[PDB]
Coordinates of C-alpha atoms in Angstrom, one line a residue:
Chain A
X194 CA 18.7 11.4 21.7
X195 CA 15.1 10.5 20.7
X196 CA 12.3 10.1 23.3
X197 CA 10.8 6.5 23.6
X198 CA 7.4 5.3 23.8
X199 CA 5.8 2.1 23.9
X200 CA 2.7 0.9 22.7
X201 CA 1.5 -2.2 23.6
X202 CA -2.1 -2.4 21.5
X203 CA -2.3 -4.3 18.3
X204 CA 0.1 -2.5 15.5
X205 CA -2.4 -3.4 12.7
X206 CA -5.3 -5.1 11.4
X207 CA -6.1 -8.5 11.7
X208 CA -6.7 -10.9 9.0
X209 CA -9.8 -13.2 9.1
X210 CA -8.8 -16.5 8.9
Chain B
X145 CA 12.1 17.5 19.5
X146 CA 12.7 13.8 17.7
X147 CA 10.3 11.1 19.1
X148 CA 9.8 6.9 18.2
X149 CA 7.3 4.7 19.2
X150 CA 7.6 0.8 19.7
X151 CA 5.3 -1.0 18.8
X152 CA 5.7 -4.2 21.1
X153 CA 3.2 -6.4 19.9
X154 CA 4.0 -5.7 16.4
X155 CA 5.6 -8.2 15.1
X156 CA 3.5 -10.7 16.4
X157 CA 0.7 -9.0 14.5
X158 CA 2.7 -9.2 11.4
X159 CA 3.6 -13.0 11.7
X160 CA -0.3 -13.8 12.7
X161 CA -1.7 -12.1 9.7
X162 CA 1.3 -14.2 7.6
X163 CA -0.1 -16.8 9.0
X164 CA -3.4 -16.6 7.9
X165 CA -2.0 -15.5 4.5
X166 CA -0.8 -19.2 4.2
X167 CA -4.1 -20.7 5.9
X168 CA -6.2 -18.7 3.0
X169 CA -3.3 -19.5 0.5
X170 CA -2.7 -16.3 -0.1
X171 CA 0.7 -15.5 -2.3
X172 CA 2.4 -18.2 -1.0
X173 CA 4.4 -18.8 -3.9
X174 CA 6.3 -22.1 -3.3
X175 CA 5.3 -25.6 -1.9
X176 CA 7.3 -28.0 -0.1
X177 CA 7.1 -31.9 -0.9
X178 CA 7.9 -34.3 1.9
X179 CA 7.4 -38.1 1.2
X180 CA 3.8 -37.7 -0.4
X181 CA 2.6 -34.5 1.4
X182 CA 2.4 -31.2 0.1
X183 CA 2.8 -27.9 2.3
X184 CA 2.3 -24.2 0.9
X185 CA 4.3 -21.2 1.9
X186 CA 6.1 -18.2 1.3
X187 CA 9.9 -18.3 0.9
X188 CA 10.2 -15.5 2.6
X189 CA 9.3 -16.4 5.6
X190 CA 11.3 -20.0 5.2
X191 CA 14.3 -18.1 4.6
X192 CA 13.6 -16.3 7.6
X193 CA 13.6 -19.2 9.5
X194 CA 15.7 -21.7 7.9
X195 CA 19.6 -21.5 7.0
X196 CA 18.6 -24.4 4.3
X197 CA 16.1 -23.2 2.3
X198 CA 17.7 -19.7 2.6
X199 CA 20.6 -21.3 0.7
X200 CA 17.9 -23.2 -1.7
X201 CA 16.3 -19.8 -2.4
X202 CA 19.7 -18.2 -2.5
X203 CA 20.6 -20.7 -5.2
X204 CA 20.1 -19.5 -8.9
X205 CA 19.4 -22.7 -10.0
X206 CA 16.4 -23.5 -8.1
X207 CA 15.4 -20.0 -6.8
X208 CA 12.2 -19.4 -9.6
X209 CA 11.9 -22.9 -8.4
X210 CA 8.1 -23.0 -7.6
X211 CA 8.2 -26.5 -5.8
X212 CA 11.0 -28.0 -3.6
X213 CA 11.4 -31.9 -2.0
X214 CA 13.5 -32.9 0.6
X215 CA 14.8 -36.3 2.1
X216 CA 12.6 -39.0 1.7
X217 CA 13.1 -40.3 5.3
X218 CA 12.2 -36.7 6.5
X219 CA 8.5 -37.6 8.0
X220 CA 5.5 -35.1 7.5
X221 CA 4.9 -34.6 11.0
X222 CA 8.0 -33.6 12.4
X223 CA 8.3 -30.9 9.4
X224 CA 4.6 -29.9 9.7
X225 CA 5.6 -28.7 13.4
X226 CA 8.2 -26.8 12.3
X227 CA 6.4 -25.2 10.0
X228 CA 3.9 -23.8 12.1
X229 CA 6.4 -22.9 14.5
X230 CA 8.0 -20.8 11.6
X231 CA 4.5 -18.7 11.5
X232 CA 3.3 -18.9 15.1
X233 CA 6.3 -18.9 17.2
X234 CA 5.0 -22.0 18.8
X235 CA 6.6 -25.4 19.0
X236 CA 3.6 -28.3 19.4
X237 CA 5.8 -31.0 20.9
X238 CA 4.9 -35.0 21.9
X239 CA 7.5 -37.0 24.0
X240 CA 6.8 -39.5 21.1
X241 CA 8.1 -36.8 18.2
X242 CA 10.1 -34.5 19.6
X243 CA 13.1 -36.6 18.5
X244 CA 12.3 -36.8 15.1
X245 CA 11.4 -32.6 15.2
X246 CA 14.8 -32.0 16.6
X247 CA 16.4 -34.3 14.0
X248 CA 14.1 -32.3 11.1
X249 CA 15.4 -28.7 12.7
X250 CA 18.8 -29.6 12.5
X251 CA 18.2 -30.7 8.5
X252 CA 16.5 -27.3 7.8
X253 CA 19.2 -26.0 9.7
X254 CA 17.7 -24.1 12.8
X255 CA 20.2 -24.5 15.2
X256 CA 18.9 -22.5 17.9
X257 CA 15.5 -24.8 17.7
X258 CA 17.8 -28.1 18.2
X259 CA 19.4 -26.0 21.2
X260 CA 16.0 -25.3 22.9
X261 CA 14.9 -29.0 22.4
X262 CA 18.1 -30.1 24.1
X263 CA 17.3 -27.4 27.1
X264 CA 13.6 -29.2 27.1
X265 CA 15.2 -32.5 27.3
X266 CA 17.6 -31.0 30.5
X267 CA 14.4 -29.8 32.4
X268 CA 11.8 -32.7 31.3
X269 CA 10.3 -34.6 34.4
Chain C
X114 CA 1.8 -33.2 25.2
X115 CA 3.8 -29.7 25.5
X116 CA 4.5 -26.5 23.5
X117 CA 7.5 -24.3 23.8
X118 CA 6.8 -20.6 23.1
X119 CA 9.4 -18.2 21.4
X120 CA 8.8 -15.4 23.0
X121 CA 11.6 -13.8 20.3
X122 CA 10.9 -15.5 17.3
X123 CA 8.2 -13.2 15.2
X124 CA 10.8 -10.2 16.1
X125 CA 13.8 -12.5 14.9
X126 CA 11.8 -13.0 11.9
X127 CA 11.0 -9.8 11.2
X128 CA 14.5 -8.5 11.4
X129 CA 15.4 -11.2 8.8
X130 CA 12.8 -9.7 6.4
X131 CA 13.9 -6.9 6.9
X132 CA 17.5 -7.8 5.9
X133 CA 16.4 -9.1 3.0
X134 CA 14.4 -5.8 2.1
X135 CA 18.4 -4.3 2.5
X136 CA 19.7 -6.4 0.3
X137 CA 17.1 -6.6 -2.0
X138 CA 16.1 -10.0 -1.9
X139 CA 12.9 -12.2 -3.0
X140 CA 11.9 -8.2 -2.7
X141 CA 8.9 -8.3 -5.3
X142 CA 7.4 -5.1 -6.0
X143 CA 8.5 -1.8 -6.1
X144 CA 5.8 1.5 -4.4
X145 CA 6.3 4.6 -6.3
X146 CA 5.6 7.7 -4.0
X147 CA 6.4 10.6 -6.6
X148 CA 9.7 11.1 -8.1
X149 CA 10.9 8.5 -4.9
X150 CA 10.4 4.9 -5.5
X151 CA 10.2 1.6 -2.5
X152 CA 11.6 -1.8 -2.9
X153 CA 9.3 -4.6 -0.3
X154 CA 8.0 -7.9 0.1
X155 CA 4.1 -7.9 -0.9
X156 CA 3.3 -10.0 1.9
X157 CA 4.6 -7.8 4.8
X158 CA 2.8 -4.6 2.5
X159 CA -0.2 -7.1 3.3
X160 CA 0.4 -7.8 6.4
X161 CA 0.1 -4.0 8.0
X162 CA -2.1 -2.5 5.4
X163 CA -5.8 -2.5 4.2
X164 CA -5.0 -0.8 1.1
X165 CA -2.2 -3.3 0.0
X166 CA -4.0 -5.9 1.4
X167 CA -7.0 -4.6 -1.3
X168 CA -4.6 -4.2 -4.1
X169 CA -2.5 -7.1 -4.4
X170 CA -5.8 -9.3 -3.3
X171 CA -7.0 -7.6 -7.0
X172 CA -6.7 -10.0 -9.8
X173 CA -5.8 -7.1 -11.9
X174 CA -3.3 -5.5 -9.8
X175 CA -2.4 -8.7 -8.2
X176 CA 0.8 -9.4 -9.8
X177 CA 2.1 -6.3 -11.3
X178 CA 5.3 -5.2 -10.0
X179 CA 5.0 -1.9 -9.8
X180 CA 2.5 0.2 -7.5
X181 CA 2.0 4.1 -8.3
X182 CA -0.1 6.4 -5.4
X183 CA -1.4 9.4 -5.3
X184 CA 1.3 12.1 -6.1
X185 CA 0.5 13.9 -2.9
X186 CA 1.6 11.3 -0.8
X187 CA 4.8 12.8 0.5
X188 CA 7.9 9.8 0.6
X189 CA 8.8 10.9 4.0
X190 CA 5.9 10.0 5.6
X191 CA 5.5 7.2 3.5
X192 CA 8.9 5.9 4.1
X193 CA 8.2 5.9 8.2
X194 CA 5.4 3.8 8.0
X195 CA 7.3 1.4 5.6
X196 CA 10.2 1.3 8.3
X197 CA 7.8 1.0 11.0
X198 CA 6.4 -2.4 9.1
X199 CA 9.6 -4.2 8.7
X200 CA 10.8 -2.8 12.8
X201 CA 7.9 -2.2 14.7
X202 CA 9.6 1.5 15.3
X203 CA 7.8 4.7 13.7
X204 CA 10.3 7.5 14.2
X205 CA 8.3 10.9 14.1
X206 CA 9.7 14.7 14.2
X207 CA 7.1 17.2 15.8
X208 CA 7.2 18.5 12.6
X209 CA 6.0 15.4 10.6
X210 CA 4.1 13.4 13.1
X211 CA 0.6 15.0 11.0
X212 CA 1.6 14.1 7.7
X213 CA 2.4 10.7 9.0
X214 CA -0.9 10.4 10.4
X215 CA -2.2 11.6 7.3
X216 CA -0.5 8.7 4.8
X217 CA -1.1 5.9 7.1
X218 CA -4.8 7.1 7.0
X219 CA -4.2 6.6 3.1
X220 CA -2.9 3.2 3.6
X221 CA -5.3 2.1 6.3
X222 CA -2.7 1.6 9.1
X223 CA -6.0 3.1 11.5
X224 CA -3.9 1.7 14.7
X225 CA -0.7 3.7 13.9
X226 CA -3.5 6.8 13.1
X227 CA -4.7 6.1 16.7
X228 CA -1.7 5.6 18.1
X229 CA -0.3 8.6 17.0
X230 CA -3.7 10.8 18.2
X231 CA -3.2 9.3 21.8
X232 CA 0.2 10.8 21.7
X233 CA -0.3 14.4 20.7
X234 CA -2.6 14.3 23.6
X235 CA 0.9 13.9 25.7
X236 CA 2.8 15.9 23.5
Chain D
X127 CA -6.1 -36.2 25.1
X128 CA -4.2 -34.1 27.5
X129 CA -3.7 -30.5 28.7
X130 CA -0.5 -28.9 27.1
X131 CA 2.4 -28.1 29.6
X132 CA 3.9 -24.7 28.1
X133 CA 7.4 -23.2 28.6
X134 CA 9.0 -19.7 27.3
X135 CA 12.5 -19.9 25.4
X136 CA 13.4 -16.4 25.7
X137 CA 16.8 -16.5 23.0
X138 CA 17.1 -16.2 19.5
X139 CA 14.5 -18.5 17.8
X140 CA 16.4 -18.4 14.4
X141 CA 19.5 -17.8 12.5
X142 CA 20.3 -13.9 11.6
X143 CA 20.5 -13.0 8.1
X144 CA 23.8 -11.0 7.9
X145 CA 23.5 -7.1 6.7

């Protein structure tokens, strides 16, 4: 059993358009 | 002491920055001719999406294939929609088009998206 | 005038990448970390990192397919973060969590760096 | 032009590619 966390913030960075 | 972490937004990130990817045309590596319009993209993600062109890319024959037409009575619009909603999870809809969208869907073979149009149609008004 | 909203879809999608990273498929390049080697999709390398985004936005580099870094780079932690990318789940052991932080740092994943700082402050 | 009415579909958005 592994311990769950969640992160809600962005995962990684953003392309310009 | 074993732990994860779940990312919930991630995803999302990923299939934004696809997005703009295809916006700046970057590696998309196949285009899609309907009537006389042109559309780039990455067969990855219309694999992803579509049970069709996952069989087109599946097929040897037309898999290095760099460029890909499709019925002639297939309008733009109603495939330009579901395009987008392929990369943004958003499906731009028109009481005047969403016939011809759910008709496209079910061509490109994305059931689910001809289920959810028949759901709109059961709550609409 | 209306728009229905997948609230699903880019996870649906992203588990069907990932099945094709299983099976190999439109995979088209290959990260070498050491002796260990990585079959992906360039785009999703793109997609979550800076330093792919760099390399295979090189000319040069562009369309090779084959990517070698540095030797230090341990596979383990490297193979987390390239899980993490196609799942949106980074599994980390107390006893690996640094070295994790360490390659992402390498691969410019700076929100999984932070991340992972705002945990050991828990843990 | 007009303001667009929006509605969640919380299923499966897409086929699943098989293991």
């Amino acid at each position: 059993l592994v311990a769950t966390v969640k992160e809600a913030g962005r995962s990684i960075h953003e392309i310009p358009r | 002491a074993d732990s994860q972490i779940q990312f919930t937004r991630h995803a999302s990130d990923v299939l934004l920055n696809l997005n703009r990817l295809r916006s700046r045309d970057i590696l998309t590596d196949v285009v899609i001719v309907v009537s006389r319009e042109q559309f780039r993209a990455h067969k990855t993600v219309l694999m992803a999406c579509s049970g069709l062109f996952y069989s087109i890319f599946t097929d040897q024959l037309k898999r290095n294939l760099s460029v890909i037409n499709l019925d002639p009575e297939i309008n733009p619009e109603g495939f330009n929609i579901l395009l987008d909603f392929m990369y943004t999870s958003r499906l731009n809809l028109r009481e005047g088009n969403i016939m011809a969208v759910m008709a496209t869907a079910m061509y490109l073979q994305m059931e689910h998206v001809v289920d959810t149009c028949r759901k709109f149609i059961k709550a609409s008004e």
